[PDB]
């Protein structure tokens, strides 16, 4: 009828793969906010446009790194402000940002544990990450809900799921870490993560997650992208 009724178009700028400069890259913040916005766009409150930029060949923002969220000409540049903007200013946002301090505290600092483990093979560092995943598993088991705070995705899921994927992919490649099979509720959560469009649409390829850490550790293009999705147990 009228442009007056158009749902808002949100643009998310994300970092490109450091292998080909075109595929989505492996930034956890990009994936988290890609996932939040995808869920909101599924709910048809918004339109989502995802723009990939090659940070060493960029085609307004100056010194700020992706992600950057553009809402009708207004550019949100700091990650904490992107969250706040999604929660407060984008329709659907308040429902996505569930209040659950228990869950916030549960998942806090998970990523630095992965980082420290990757430095080199160290079982003590491996087991520190494993203890945290046990806590998450035991939360999930106690709640018996599909996701962290219930049967619907929230903000905390979009933060957790991308880190579980870097743990699986980079954990295994660099230091032969695997998430053990007795973490039944956690494996069931990942099983569902792989069935989720927001996840699979935003998930970088394995090669890009790996390359991401290789550059971080300064080690060393035709490898066809593949995606780790297997579950080592029956569900
Ligand atoms: Ca940013």
Curated annotation (Swiss-Prot):
Taxonomy, superkingdom: Eukaryota
Chain ranges passing through the membrane: 29-53
Family label: Belongs to the chloride channel CLIC family.
Entry keyword set: Membrane, Mitochondrion, Transmembrane, Transmembrane helix
Cited InterPro entries: CLIC_N, Glutathione-S-Trfase_C_sf, Thioredoxin-like_sf
Cellular location(s): Mitochondrion; Membrane
Pfam families for this protein: CLIC-like_N
Protein name (Swiss-Prot/TrEMBL): Chloride intracellular channel Clic
Record's comment describing the protein's domains: Members of this family may change from a globular, soluble state to a state where the N-terminal domain is inserted into the membrane and functions as a chloride channel. A conformation change of the N-terminal domain is thought to expose hydrophobic surfaces that trigger membrane insertion.
GO terms (BP aspect): chloride transport; negative gravitaxis; response to alcohol
GO molecular function: calcium ion binding; chloride channel activity; glutathione peroxidase activity; lipid binding
Principal location class: mitochondrion
Source species: Drosophila melanogaster
Tissues expressed in: Expressed in cardiac tubes.
GO cellular component, one term: membrane
Presence of the UniProt keyword 4Fe-4S in the record: no
Alphabetical list of PANTHER family matching this protein: CHLORIDE INTRACELLULAR CHANNEL CLIC, CHLORIDE INTRACELLULAR CHANNEL, ISOFORM A
Biological role: Might insert into membranes and form chloride ion channels. Channel activity depends on the pH. May play a role in ethanol sensitivity.
Membrane topology category: Single-pass membrane protein
């Amino acid at each position: 009828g009228s442009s007056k009724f158009d749902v808002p178009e949100i643009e998310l700028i994300i970092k490109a793969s450091t292998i080909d400069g075109r595929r989505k890259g492996a930034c956890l913040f990009c994936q988290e906010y890609f996932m939040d916005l995808y869920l909101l766009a599924e709910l048809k409150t918004i339109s989502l446009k995802v723009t990939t930029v090659d940070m060493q060949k960029p085609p307004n923002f100056e010194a700020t790194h992706p992600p950057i969220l553009i809402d009708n000409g207004l550019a949100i540049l700091e990650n904490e402000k992107i969250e706040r903007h999604i929660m407060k200013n984008i329709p659907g946002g308040y429902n996505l940002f569930v209040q659950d301090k228990e869950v916030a505290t549960l998942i806090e600092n998970l990523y630095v544990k992965l980082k420290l483990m990757l430095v080199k093979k160290d079982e003590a560092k491996n087991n520190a990450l494993l203890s945290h995943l046990r806590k998450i598993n035991d939360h999930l088991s106690a709640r018996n809900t599909r996701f962290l705070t219930g049967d619907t995705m929230c903000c905390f899921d979009c933060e957790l799921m991308p880190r579980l994927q870097h743990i699986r992919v980079a954990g295994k490649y660099f230091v032969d870490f695997e998430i053990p099979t007795h973490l039944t509720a956690l494996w069931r959560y990942m099983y569902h993560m792989y069935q989720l469009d927001a996840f699979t649409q935003s998930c970088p390829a394995d090669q890009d997650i790996i390359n991401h850490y290789k550059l971080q550790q300064s080690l060393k293009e035709l490898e066809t992208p593949t995606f780790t999705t297997y579950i080592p147990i029956d569900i």
